Paper text:
The papain-like protease (PLpro) of [name] ([name]-[name]-2) plays a critical role in the proteolytic processing of viral polyproteins and the dysregulation of the host immune response, providing a promising therapeutic target. The papain-like protease (PLpro) and chymotrypsin-like protease (called 3CLpro, also referred to as main protease) are two essential cysteine proteases encoded by the [name]-[name]-2 genome. Both of them are required to cleave two viral polyproteins (pp1a and pp1ab) to generate 16 mature nonstructural proteins for genome transcription and replication. In addition, [name]-[name]-2 PLpro recognizes and cleaves the C-terminal LxGG sequence of ubiquitin (Ub) and ubiquitin-like proteins (UbLs) such as interferon-stimulated gene product 15 (ISG15) to remove the Ub and UbL modifications from host proteins, respectively. The deubiquitinase (DUB) activity of [name]-[name]-2 PLpro is thought to induce dysregulation in the host immune response against viral infection and replication.
Author numbering:
A (entry chain C): 4 to 24, 29 to 314
B (entry chain A): 2 to 314
């Protein structure tokens, strides 16, 4: 006989004596598949992830991961088997990722996540972000890939990754109020709540968003849309990549993207004592920056416009 | 102690007789239950339900097996979104506009309408039996379950603002485009020359330009040299190709393309329309049909039909 632990969370462990001769469901050990394995007595006392196969386990996995998808732990453990072999360099006080399996977009998001103020809802994300800040970001990246339905090696979007993670963050109290003025359609005001309130695609400049941007109305003409009010701990401004000048102290972080929609390399720029650009494990300093930026992140508390 | 005998299913192909007590709801006995799209999970069985077929989420091995054989998914929340959307899409109207099945406007269904019209003009063979069944009934004028499946496959709900390119992107993964091939060549005068071969869904989709002709001549793309490089189409093997770009003004010429997605607005909120090249250029906006000899407007997807192409450069 062998006495081992089964879990879905790795926080609530079920004592479950296993016989020497699967027999508990598809199971894993430290990220590795143990479906084929008969218990070695090297496993006495070890904990094994078991894909939920009961009501008690299934409600445990939901209170931790906030999802009922049975495929979640399978894609998580499969990503975790790769992410736990990644290197997480300490760059400029932040936890990064050394390049591997086209993880450039995942590293840029991870550096951004450590610089804006988010409160995650699922315990799995709360636990792993603090593990990531402690220097071991393997659980966090594996969960991010699982939540965005992506596999290791696959290419992704920084903006689209943040969008997925914002769905699992308590941004319910964040509010945005917009006014669009078309000259032949009038003046109309819109209120956005939740994730839609902190995300915009169309311009990188938070100042021009405040002063009003030109957008197509349904009349076909150019209409002016401007920010009336913003209640948020941050705002993410995005636009298709194009040359852009980042000025020190006027933003939090930024995503630089060289390439096109089919293939490109992400980089991360952050504003500290000067401009730091973090590639993977590489760091370059600069007082001025100008390059192809596609995301800029700003700090915010509460804003009301003058127009 | 009254009972009635109903039938449960996840595909309406395999039907499992179930005696259920009228003392308790369908939820306490099956989990989430649906009758013709209506959520009856907290309703206790009437006498009017006997003999009828209900939909429920997978709770057993064969219940999970049947759901995957049909929909090619094991997420039990799929049918919860599938039938909840069919509860709306069955009350939409599906008129025949210019020989195609369209959708009258409702709950921001323009992106589905434009997608639906596009699916009927390109050659698509779907993998999940649910899609191939609903797609044939969609061409017949009953797209209620085809669009319900599309929204569930795209993780989108009725009333949600949508994107046509994303929609086709999701449906393309559920289609057999295995035999589709694309070969591209990139040259930067500082990085050098390199060739790549893409298969399947990535072989029929490109984001960057609307002109299939320009793709063949070559488009200017950034290399991480810092310099601009030229990427051009070396070889294409597909029944169609979908070219996409951020919305901009564009001239559509009769007979040079199959169909096109018109988007007026911005990323946050805009309006889709469908342009199709027939004997002249027709615009389809839900149930509304207009036409013009030439066309200029904001276009974001252009579909071309293809056989096989090999370049001369
Ligand atoms: Zn207007
Ligand atoms: Zn180059």
């Amino acid at each position: 006989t062998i006495k081992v632990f089964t879990t879905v969370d790795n926080i609530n462990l079920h004592t479950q004596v296993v016989d020497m001769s699967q027999q508990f469901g598809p199971t894993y050990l430290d990220g590795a598949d143990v479906t084929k394995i008969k218990p070695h007595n090297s496993h006495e006392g070890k904990t094994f992830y078991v894909l939920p196969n009961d009501d008690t386990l299934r409600v445990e996995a939901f209170e931790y991961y906030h999802t009922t998808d049975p495929s979640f732990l399978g894609r998580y453990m499969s990503a975790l088997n790769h992410t736990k072999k990644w290197k997480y360099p300490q760059v400029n006080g932040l936890t990064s990722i050394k390049w591997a399996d086209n993880n450039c977009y995942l590293a840029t998001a991870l550096l951004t996540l450590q610089q804006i103020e988010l409160k995650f809802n699922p315990p799995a994300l709360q636990d792993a972000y603090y593990r990531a800040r402690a220097g071991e970001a393997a659980n966090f990246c594996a969960l991010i890939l699982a939540y965005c339905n992506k596999t290791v090696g696959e290419l992704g979007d920084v903006r689209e990754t943040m969008s997925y993670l914002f769905q699992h963050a308590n941004l319910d109290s964040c509010k945005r109020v917009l006014n669009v003025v078309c000259k032949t359609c009038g003046q109309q005001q819109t209120t956005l709540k939740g994730v839609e309130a902190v995300m915009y695609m169309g311009t990188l400049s938070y100042e021009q968003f405040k002063k009003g941007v030109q957008i197509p109305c349904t009349c076909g003409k150019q209409a002016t849309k401007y920010l009336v009010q913003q209640e948020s701990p941050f705002v993410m401004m995005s636009a298709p990549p194009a040359q852009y000048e980042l000025k020190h102290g006027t933003f939090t972080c930024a995503s630089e993207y060289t390439g096109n929609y089919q293939c490109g390399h992400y980089k991360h720029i952050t504003s500290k004592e000067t401009l730091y650009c973090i590639d993977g494990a590489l760091l370059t300093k600069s007082s001025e920056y100008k390059g192809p930026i596609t995301d800029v992140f700003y700090k915010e508390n509460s804003y009301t416009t003058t127009i």
